[PDB]
Amino acid sequence: MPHAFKPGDLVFAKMKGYPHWPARIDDIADGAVKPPPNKYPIFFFGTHETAFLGPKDLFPYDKSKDKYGKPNKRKGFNEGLWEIQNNPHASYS
C-alpha cells in the first residue's frame, strides 16, 4: 500500500495551464525556504523550476507514465522526459 510522499519520489505534477509534467519531490536544503503547510517542493525536470504543490496535483510516475510520458511541444518537456527516465536523482543545479 502507498505511503505519504517523500523527497526522491518521481511524479507527473499538474499545474493549471500546463500538461502533466515530469517532476520529483525535492528535499529542502538546510537554511533554504520551506514550502507552505501541506505543500511539497516540486522540482520540474527539463525546466528545472520549483513550485509548491499539494498531493491532488501529484501523480506517481510508474502508474502514470503510459498516459503522460509522451513528447510535448512545450519548452523543456522532452528534456524533462529524458531526465526522469535516465537520471531522476541527479543534481540539476
Curated annotation (Swiss-Prot):
Widely expressed. High expression is found in heart, skeletal muscle, ovary and testis. Overexpression is frequently observed in hepatocellular carcinoma samples. It is found in: Nucleus; Cytoplasm. Residues 7-64 form the PWWP domain. Acts as an epigenetic regulator of myogenesis in cooperation with DPF3a (isoform 2 of DPF3/BAF45C). Associates with the BAF complex via its interaction with DPF3a and HDGFL2-DPF3a activate myogenic genes by increasing chromatin accessibility through recruitment of SMARCA4/BRG1/BAF190A (ATPase subunit of the BAF complex) to myogenic gene promoters. Promotes the repair of DNA double-strand breaks (DSBs) through the homologous recombination pathway by facilitating the recruitment of the DNA endonuclease RBBP8 to the DSBs. Interacts with HDGF. Interacts with trimethylated 'Lys-36' of histone H3 (H3K36me3). Interacts with trimethylated 'Lys-79' of histone H3 (H3K79me3), but has higher affinity for H3K36me3. Interacts with IWS1. Interacts with H2AX, POGZ, RBBP8 and CBX1. Interacts with histones H3K9me3, H3K27me3 and H3K36me2. Interacts with DPF3a (isoform 2 of DPF3/BAF45C). Interacts with SMARCA4/BRG1/BAF190A, SMARCC1/BAF155 and SMARCD1/BAF60A in a DPF3a-dependent manner. Belongs to the HDGF family. This is Hepatoma-derived growth factor-related protein 2. It comes from Homo sapiens. The gene is HDGFL2.
